[PDB]
Design an enzyme around this catalytic site. Structure first.
Site, PDB file in Angstrom:
ATOM      1  N   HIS A  17       0.754  -1.250   0.000  1.00  0.00           N
ATOM      2  CA  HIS A  17       0.000   0.000   0.000  1.00  0.00           C
ATOM      3  C   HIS A  17       0.782   1.297   0.000  1.00  0.00           C
ATOM      4  O   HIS A  17       0.240   2.334  -0.346  1.00  0.00           O
ATOM      5  CB  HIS A  17      -0.963   0.011   1.168  1.00  0.00           C
ATOM      6  CG  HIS A  17      -2.046  -1.005   1.054  1.00  0.00           C
ATOM      7  ND1 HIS A  17      -3.057  -1.119   1.981  1.00  0.00           N
ATOM      8  CD2 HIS A  17      -2.296  -1.936   0.107  1.00  0.00           C
ATOM      9  CE1 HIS A  17      -3.886  -2.077   1.609  1.00  0.00           C
ATOM     10  NE2 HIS A  17      -3.447  -2.589   0.474  1.00  0.00           N
ATOM     11  N   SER A  71      -0.229  -0.439  -6.642  1.00  0.00           N
ATOM     12  CA  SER A  71      -0.105  -1.852  -6.930  1.00  0.00           C
ATOM     13  C   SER A  71       0.538  -1.773  -8.315  1.00  0.00           C
ATOM     14  O   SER A  71       0.251  -0.847  -9.064  1.00  0.00           O
ATOM     15  CB  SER A  71      -1.493  -2.493  -6.996  1.00  0.00           C
ATOM     16  OG  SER A  71      -1.414  -3.912  -6.978  1.00  0.00           O
ATOM     17  N   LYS A  86     -14.122  -8.878  -8.842  1.00  0.00           N
ATOM     18  CA  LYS A  86     -13.092  -9.557  -9.613  1.00  0.00           C
ATOM     19  C   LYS A  86     -12.464 -10.715  -8.829  1.00  0.00           C
ATOM     20  O   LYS A  86     -12.385 -11.824  -9.330  1.00  0.00           O
ATOM     21  CB  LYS A  86     -12.025  -8.529  -9.996  1.00  0.00           C
ATOM     22  CG  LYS A  86     -10.773  -9.070 -10.633  1.00  0.00           C
ATOM     23  CD  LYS A  86     -10.945  -9.416 -12.083  1.00  0.00           C
ATOM     24  CE  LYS A  86      -9.612  -9.821 -12.647  1.00  0.00           C
ATOM     25  NZ  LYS A  86      -8.596  -8.779 -12.321  1.00  0.00           N
ATOM     26  N   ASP A  87     -12.024 -10.456  -7.603  1.00  0.00           N
ATOM     27  CA  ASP A  87     -11.409 -11.486  -6.777  1.00  0.00           C
ATOM     28  C   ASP A  87     -12.351 -12.601  -6.350  1.00  0.00           C
ATOM     29  O   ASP A  87     -11.978 -13.769  -6.356  1.00  0.00           O
ATOM     30  CB  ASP A  87     -10.794 -10.855  -5.546  1.00  0.00           C
ATOM     31  CG  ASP A  87      -9.722  -9.875  -5.899  1.00  0.00           C
ATOM     32  OD1 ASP A  87      -9.546  -9.644  -7.110  1.00  0.00           O
ATOM     33  OD2 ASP A  87      -9.059  -9.333  -4.986  1.00  0.00           O
ATOM     34  N   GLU A 142       6.757 -33.646   0.399  1.00  0.00           N
ATOM     35  CA  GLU A 142       5.606 -33.325  -0.448  1.00  0.00           C
ATOM     36  C   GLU A 142       6.024 -32.655  -1.746  1.00  0.00           C
ATOM     37  O   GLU A 142       7.061 -31.987  -1.803  1.00  0.00           O
ATOM     38  CB  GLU A 142       4.627 -32.426   0.302  1.00  0.00           C
ATOM     39  CG  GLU A 142       3.864 -33.115   1.396  1.00  0.00           C
ATOM     40  CD  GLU A 142       2.970 -34.195   0.850  1.00  0.00           C
ATOM     41  OE1 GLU A 142       1.978 -33.886   0.156  1.00  0.00           O
ATOM     42  OE2 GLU A 142       3.276 -35.373   1.104  1.00  0.00           O
TER      43      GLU A 142
HETATM   44  C1  HEM Z   1       0.921 -16.188   2.391  1.00  0.00           C
HETATM   45  C2  HEM Z   1       1.617 -15.069   1.976  1.00  0.00           C
HETATM   46  C3  HEM Z   1       1.204 -14.159   0.993  1.00  0.00           C
HETATM   47  C4  HEM Z   1      -0.012 -13.513   0.899  1.00  0.00           C
HETATM   48  C5  HEM Z   1      -1.329 -13.820   1.613  1.00  0.00           C
HETATM   49  C6  HEM Z   1       0.266 -12.411   0.030  1.00  0.00           C
HETATM   50  C7  HEM Z   1      -0.655 -11.497  -0.209  1.00  0.00           C
HETATM   51  C8  HEM Z   1      -0.537 -10.511  -1.125  1.00  0.00           C
HETATM   52  C9  HEM Z   1      -1.597  -9.576  -1.411  1.00  0.00           C
HETATM   53  C10 HEM Z   1      -2.933  -9.435  -0.662  1.00  0.00           C
HETATM   54  C11 HEM Z   1      -1.200  -8.913  -2.504  1.00  0.00           C
HETATM   55  C12 HEM Z   1      -2.050  -8.040  -3.438  1.00  0.00           C
HETATM   56  C13 HEM Z   1      -2.569  -8.501  -4.824  1.00  0.00           C
HETATM   57  C14 HEM Z   1      -1.466  -8.878  -5.806  1.00  0.00           C
HETATM   58  O1  HEM Z   1      -0.736  -7.965  -6.270  1.00  0.00           O
HETATM   59  O2  HEM Z   1      -1.331 -10.086  -6.107  1.00  0.00           O
HETATM   60  C15 HEM Z   1       0.172  -9.238  -2.568  1.00  0.00           C
HETATM   61  C16 HEM Z   1       0.995  -8.592  -3.324  1.00  0.00           C
HETATM   62  C17 HEM Z   1       2.261  -8.908  -3.541  1.00  0.00           C
HETATM   63  N1  HEM Z   1       2.864  -9.988  -2.977  1.00  0.00           N
HETATM   64 FE1  HEM Z   1       2.239 -11.196  -1.840  1.00  0.00          FE
HETATM   65  N2  HEM Z   1       1.497 -12.414  -0.584  1.00  0.00           N
HETATM   66  C18 HEM Z   1       2.038 -13.584  -0.069  1.00  0.00           C
HETATM   67  C19 HEM Z   1       3.264 -14.076  -0.457  1.00  0.00           C
HETATM   68  C20 HEM Z   1       4.127 -13.388  -1.295  1.00  0.00           C
HETATM   69  C21 HEM Z   1       5.407 -13.885  -1.762  1.00  0.00           C
HETATM   70  C22 HEM Z   1       6.089 -15.204  -1.443  1.00  0.00           C
HETATM   71  C23 HEM Z   1       5.973 -12.890  -2.450  1.00  0.00           C
HETATM   72  C24 HEM Z   1       7.324 -12.783  -2.776  1.00  0.00           C
HETATM   73  C25 HEM Z   1       8.179 -13.659  -3.447  1.00  0.00           C
HETATM   74  C26 HEM Z   1       4.950 -11.886  -2.573  1.00  0.00           C
HETATM   75  C27 HEM Z   1       5.068 -10.778  -3.335  1.00  0.00           C
HETATM   76  C28 HEM Z   1       4.106  -9.838  -3.525  1.00  0.00           C
HETATM   77  C29 HEM Z   1       4.266  -8.618  -4.304  1.00  0.00           C
HETATM   78  C30 HEM Z   1       5.465  -8.130  -5.039  1.00  0.00           C
HETATM   79  C31 HEM Z   1       3.040  -8.169  -4.495  1.00  0.00           C
HETATM   80  C32 HEM Z   1       2.495  -7.615  -5.797  1.00  0.00           C
HETATM   81  C33 HEM Z   1       2.725  -6.216  -6.305  1.00  0.00           C
HETATM   82  C34 HEM Z   1       2.184  -6.021  -7.705  1.00  0.00           C
HETATM   83  O3  HEM Z   1       2.716  -6.641  -8.641  1.00  0.00           O
HETATM   84  O4  HEM Z   1       1.217  -5.254  -7.866  1.00  0.00           O
HETATM   85  N3  HEM Z   1       3.816 -12.157  -1.870  1.00  0.00           N
HETATM   86  N4  HEM Z   1       0.586 -10.312  -1.868  1.00  0.00           N
END
Ligand code: HEM
Ligand SMILES: CCCCCCCC/C=C\CCCCCCCC(=O)OC[C@H](COP(=O)(O)OCCN)OC(=O)CCCCCCC/C=C\CCCCCCCC
Ligand SMILES: CCCCCCCC/C=C\CCCCCCCC(=O)OC[C@H](COP(=O)(O)OCCN)OC(=O)CCCCCCC/C=C\CCCCCCCC
Ligand code: HEM
Ligand code: HEM
Ligand SMILES: CCCCCCCCO[C@@H]1O[C@H](CO)[C@@H](O)[C@H](O)[C@H]1O
Lengths: 66, 59, 100, 78, 379, 241, 49
Positions: free
Chosen positions: E201, E205, E227-228, E271
């Site tokens: 945030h 995004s 959408k989600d 796994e």
């Molecule tokens: C269980 C853990 C995780 C949850 C629940 C989580 C959740 C989220 C959420 C709510 C978003 C927003 C929607 C989206 O852009 O897809 C987000 C964004 C992001 N997450 Fe995660 N994430 C998780 C794991 C990770 C991992 C492993 C990575 C890193 C390798 C990561 C990298 C990112 C980044 C870079 C953004 C997206 C920014 C964009 O491209 O707009 N997240 N994540």
């Protein structure tokens, strides 16, 4: 009483693959029992026959079972 | 004019909407189950105990 | 034997950022330099780019591109920011140097 | 960052219609399906390759392993 | 204030994160995984909690407590299934989530990306220590082989493993601490998941075309909420189909035999969602280096942000690296395969090759094809 | 040699995603478990109580538990004593402990069949093939004292002698008890014994599939509906020049 | 000058068949909203289940 199994196997054992496989088997069988000092086993050749026989036994066996 | 009748009577008032989401659910449940069960069981005639039952409970 | 000029044109059409209707410079990632750079850009260009960039996001939003005709042709791509972006970078390296 | 301070925008006029004055999933053929294809045929040649490649190697591998088990008719002709 | 939805200390938090939140308009469907990942978590924690309420963590009751839960606890069977299969839905998503970021350069948002790596590590651990619980042959043997690995760590090695679990070998005193650990970590995931979204945030995004979205954002809720939720169902349906029709499709049968220390199964493997690394682990012979390869197979993610050279963020307009990218997933996919197989000839080779092609594509090709790709654009 | 033969694949009456178990067959199986296997194989997780409403009547099952007596809690003097099993008792264990059994079956240990069907690759297809499948070892191959060649079993030497031939028992429902046939029912039993849910789990799977079918299109139309305002949108640039 | 600006045509292009000038949009839309809301009404409904 006659087990449908043995009947449906007799048929199967006549299908090409089987017959073709039974042969390739009987050969190895009579060849491994002919020598005194060999490491060969006829497992492989045997399976191929079974992997073939059974495969069709399945396509039909259960048709006769209740 | 269902759709139009629908809107006017059922979907216009936030109140009415919710109220038919419920009454609509009760009716959907009852109907959707029977139907499914039916479809299910029929695809399995004579296999379920409900079917084999009588033989041992007398019959 | 093989023109970089032949290549560059290959890549340009290969990349495809023109099917959206935007110039090369309309895609450079906005790090610190590009940010200063764009801020120096004349207003003519700024609004031009602004619209382009938005028109691209909208296509992309719709999963649809621009008709072949409207595709910017390699040879007509206008490097509107590179001149600026350049001074910014050497202006900086000058300072990155003096402070040592 | 909130709404009202994102960017200096000027001279863009947009037109849009209420969701109820238009169609949701319109022109599935006129423009819909074409573009879907306009896409499958746009990346297939970029994604497919390494996957196809992977496959061949998977097969080769499994087949070979499954061959190195069976005996060579000649490891003993005596 | 008027709105009374933007003034209240708590609602203001929500109305600023699921409503009124500026989201780009062109967000792709790949962005649906953060959402899923989150709800994926709510789901686990739920089913888990509800499942933990019938479990006993003791060598002599574990295996059957689970069995009992399935045969006796009403709808117990379903709950276990969902939880088990859910673990996978979880990884499939987390893997597509990584992906999207790797190729839209989402990782350039360092802080939000680094925490994400911490999320992955955490989500793993919790899933390793969680599979032991049912205490079946694989649960046990997997725990014994994978844990003993630290043994390579010179000096302060043996003493770690030897303390990690109970005393001298995976036995009761470790099932307990594993159960505990399993119960704790998920809440830490949720905790951190908050930090993740915070950092996110901070900036907007990211988006597919990788260029400033400010030009035109859209209120999250009216749109993306819908959408989600769509994505939620479109992805949740297979989950259930799998969960309800082939419950064991992805589960080793050997784990239906109560653990027995006098029978090591053949083919001990973690796994699927761990395989790719299990592979890269047995790629290098020197036991020590092996662990390092393993450790580096994931930790490399911390380096990705320093290997970005393209003058462009995403790689939409970067056909070369585009194939490199797919050539890479394909590579991981292969490592997975190699991992499920025995350590024999056809494999052993393909293994260390793929394993090598892994670190090169990330460490050396990508960055290189990166700059070279820049020259071609006259930069 | 890590060489093995893999079971074929029979069209079980319960393999359909929407097809449940044939309880009439399950009922039978129970019988072959009870009258032939149960003398070596334990089935610790099932109990008479379960048969009730699935392949046996309450009273029917009640009387079936009586046939066996079970060891029960301390006296008023503190000692173990016997008594006719109730409906709540679990199927009897043939041996007091493993080593006790290993010594009655020449070293080997007959596994508990509770989850067998899912403890081996192939499940029923496996077990079936194994049961109706012993034969003389191929040439060059010799099985040792006490073991019996069976190709379908890894190592091809099982501590288990062919446990099932024609008759051996008599299905009372009036069914041609041929080895092949009897083994079928035993397998459909083992299935049920391993996952009693089965039928319930599938009727459920049906209901879920229909919801997904109905739910996704709705939210799809809904998603499409809200968005349209953008998909259809139209930009235009008008600098005053 | 703004007087020089028109709204493009969504006619056919997007408008549902009950929308083409010289005909009141209003007589036809309580029917148009009726459908949409019905679809939503049904989802809430299916979901509750
Ligand atoms: C269980 C853990 C995780 C949850 C629940 C989580 C959740 C989220 C959420 C709510 C978003 C927003 C929607 C989206 O852009 O897809 C987000 C964004 C992001 N997450 Fe995660 N994430 C998780 C794991 C990770 C991992 C492993 C990575 C890193 C390798 C990561 C990298 C990112 C980044 C870079 C953004 C997206 C920014 C964009 O491209 O707009 N997240 N994540
Ligand atoms: C069986 C009988 C069961 C009865 C038990 C009791 C529960 C009764 C139902 C109470 C609900 C009343 C609904 C009030 C909500 C309606 C609403 O105010 O706003 C609608 C509204 C906006 O649509 P509009 O068309 O603009 O509405 C304008 C209306 N004139 O928002 C509604 O989306 C969201 C509706 C739900 C649809 C999206 C589905 C989400 C579900 C995810 C799939 C997962 C389900 C599986 C497990 C869940 C755990
Ligand atoms: C590790 C465990 C690995 C194994 C897990 C298995 C999952 C199997 C992979 C299935 C992949 C489905 C891909 C369908 C792709 C469709 C498509 O070809 O087009 C590509 C496409 C569109 O191109 P644009 O230029 O944006 O279009 C312009 C905008 N309109 O977008 C796709 O990126 C995003 C793809 C994400 C790939 C999914 C890969 C997941 C695995 C990689 C994680 C790697 C990181 C390193 C270690 C893992 C720990
Ligand atoms: C009754 C018809 C019956 C069934 C069914 C049955 C099954 C069975 C299976 C599936 C196994 C496991 C095979 C494996 O390890 O993969 C198995 C094993 C043994 N059995 Fe059995 N068996 C049935 C009946 C009997 C009977 C009557 C006895 C005792 C007289 C018996 C014994 C054993 C033993 C011993 C094993 C050997 C295990 C080994 O590792 O060699 N079985 N049985
Ligand atoms: C982060 C989410 C979680 C993941 C990734 C996860 C994963 C797993 C895994 C892999 C299993 C093994 C299933 C099997 O036996 O095949 C499992 C089991 C278990 N988990 Fe979780 N779990 C999570 C959260 C929880 C939580 C928070 C609880 C409850 C507080 C919980 C309690 C248990 C219990 C009791 C078992 C043993 C029962 C069983 O395995 O069937 N889980 N979990
Ligand atoms: C997201 C879609 C969810 C689909 C609804 C799940 C339906 C579960 O429905 C179940 O069906 C069984 C078989 O009749 C009944 O015995 C259970 O009592 C009932 O809860």
């Amino acid at each position: 009483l006659v087990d449908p199994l043995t009947t449906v196997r007799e048929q199967c054992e006549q299908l090409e693959k089987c017959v073709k496989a039974r042969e390739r088997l009987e050969l190895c069988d009579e060849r491994v029992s002919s020598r005194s000092q060999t490491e060969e086993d006829c497992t492989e050749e045997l399976f191929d026959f079974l992997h073939a026989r059974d495969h069709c036994v399945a396509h039909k066996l259960f048709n006769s079972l209740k | 004019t269902l759709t139009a009748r629908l809107y006017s009577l059922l979907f216009r008032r936030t109140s009415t909407f919710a109220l038919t989401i419920v009454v609509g659910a009760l009716l959907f449940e009852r109907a959707f189950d029977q139907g499914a069960d039916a479809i299910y069981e029929h695809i399995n005639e004579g296999k379920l105990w409900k079917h084999i039952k009588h033989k041992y409970e007398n019959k | 034997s093989r023109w970089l000029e032949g290549i560059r044109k290959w890549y340009y059409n290969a990349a495809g950022f023109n099917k959206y209707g935007l110039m090369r410079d309309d895609t450079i990632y906005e790090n610190d330099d590009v940010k200063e750079a764009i801020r120096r850009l004349p207003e003519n260009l700024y609004d031009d780019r602004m619209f382009r960039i938005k028109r691209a996001l909208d296509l992309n939003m719709r999963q649809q591109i621009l008709p072949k005709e409207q595709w910017t042709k390699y040879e007509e791509d206008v490097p509107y920011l590179e001149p600026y972006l350049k001074e910014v970078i050497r202006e900086r390296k000058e300072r990155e140097e003096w402070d040592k | 960052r909130q709404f009202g301070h994102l960017t200096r925008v000027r001279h863009l006029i947009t037109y849009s219609l209420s969701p109820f004055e238009q169609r949701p999933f319109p022109h599935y053929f006129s423009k819909g399906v074409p573009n879907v294809w306009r896409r499958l045929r746009a990346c297939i040649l970029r994604v497919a390759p390494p996957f196809l490649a992977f496959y061949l190697l998977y097969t080769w591998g499994t087949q070979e392993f499954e061959k190195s088990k069976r005996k060579n008719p000649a490891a003993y002709v005596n | 204030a008027p709105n009374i939805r933007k003034s209240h200390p708590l609602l203001k938090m929500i109305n600023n994160s699921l409503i009124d939140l500026p989201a780009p308009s062109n967000i792709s469907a790949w962005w649906n995984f953060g959402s899923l990942l989150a709800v994926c978590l709510m789901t686990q924690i739920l089913t888990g909690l509800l499942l933990a309420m019938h479990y006993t963590a003791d060598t002599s009751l574990a295996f059957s407590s689970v069995a009992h839960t399935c045969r006796n606890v009403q709808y117990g069977w379903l709950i276990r299934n969902l939880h088990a299969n859910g673990a996978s839905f979880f990884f499939i998503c987390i893997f597509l989530h990584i992906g999207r970021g790797l190729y839209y350069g989402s990782y350039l948002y360092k802080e939000t990306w680094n925490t994400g790596v911490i999320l992955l590590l955490t989500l793993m651990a919790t899933a390793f220590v969680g599979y032991v619980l049912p205490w079946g042959q694989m649960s046990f043997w997997g725990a014994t082989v994978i844990t003993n690995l630290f043994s390579a760590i010179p000096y302060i090695g043996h003493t770690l493993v030897e303390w990690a679990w109970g005393g001298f070998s995976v036995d009761n005193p470790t099932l307990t601490r594993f159960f505990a650990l399993h119960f704790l970590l998920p809440f830490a995931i949720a905790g951190i998941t908050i930090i993740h979204l915070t950092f996110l945030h901070e900036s907007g995004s990211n988006n597919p075309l990788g260029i400033s979205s400010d030009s035109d954002k859209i209120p999250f809720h009216p749109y993306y909420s819908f959408k989600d939720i769509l994505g939620l169902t479109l992805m949740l349906t297979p989950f259930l189909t799998l969960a309800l029709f082939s419950p064991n499709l992805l589960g080793d049968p050997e784990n239906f035999t109560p653990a027995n220390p006098l029978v090591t199964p053949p083919h001990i493997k973690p796994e699927w969602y761990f395989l790719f690394a299990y592979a890269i682990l047995r790629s290098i012979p020197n036991k020590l280096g092996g662990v390092l390869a393993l450790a580096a197979s994931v930790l490399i993610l911390f380096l990705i942000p320093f290997l970005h050279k393209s003058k462009q963020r995403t790689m939409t307009f970067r056909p070369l690296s585009q194939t490199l990218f797919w050539l890479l997933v394909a590579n991981l996919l292969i490592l997975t395969w190699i991992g499920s197989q025995p350590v024999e000839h056809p494999f052993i080779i393909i293994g260390q090759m793929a394993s090598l092609s892994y670190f090169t594509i990330l460490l050396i090709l990508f960055p290189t094809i990166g700059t070279l790709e820049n020259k071609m654009l006259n930069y | 040699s890590d060489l093995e033969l893999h079971p074929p694949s029979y069209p079980w009456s319960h393999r359909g995603p929407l097809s449940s178990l044939d309880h009439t067959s399950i009922r039978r199986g129970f019988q072959v478990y009870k009258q032939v296997c149960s003398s070596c194989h334990s089935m610790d997780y099932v109990a008479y109580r379960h048969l009730v409403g699935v392949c046996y009547t309450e009273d029917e099952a009640k009387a079936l538990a009586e046939e066996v007596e079970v060891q029960d809690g301390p006296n008023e003097d503190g000692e173990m004593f016997m008594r006719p099993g109730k409906l709540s008792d679990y199927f009897p264990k043939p041996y007091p402990n493993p080593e006790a059994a290993r010594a009655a079956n020449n070293g080997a240990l007959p596994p508990d069949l509770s989850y067998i069907v899912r403890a081996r690759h192939g499940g029923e297809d496996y077990v079936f093939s194994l049961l109706t499948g012993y034969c003389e070892p191929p040439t060059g191959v010799s099985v040792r004292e006490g073991l019996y060649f069976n190709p379908y079993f890894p190592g091809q030497a099982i501590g288990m002698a062919p446990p099932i031939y024609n008759d051996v028992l008599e299905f009372d429902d009036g069914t041609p008890a041929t080895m092949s046939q009897v083994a079928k029912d035993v397998c459909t039993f083992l299935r049920w014994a391993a996952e009693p849910e089965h039928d319930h789990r599938k009727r459920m799977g049906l209901k879920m599939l229909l919801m997904m079918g109905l739910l996704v299109p709705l939210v799809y139309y809904m998603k499409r509906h809200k968005w349209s305002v953008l998909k259809s949108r139209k930009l235009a640039y008008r600098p005053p020049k | 000058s703004h007087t020089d600006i028109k709204v493009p045509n969504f006619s056919d292009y997007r408008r549902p068949p009950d929308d083409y000038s010289t005909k009141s949009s209003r007589e036809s839309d309580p029917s148009r909203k009726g459908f949409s809301y019905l679809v939503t009404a049904v989802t809430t409904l299916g979901v509750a289940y």
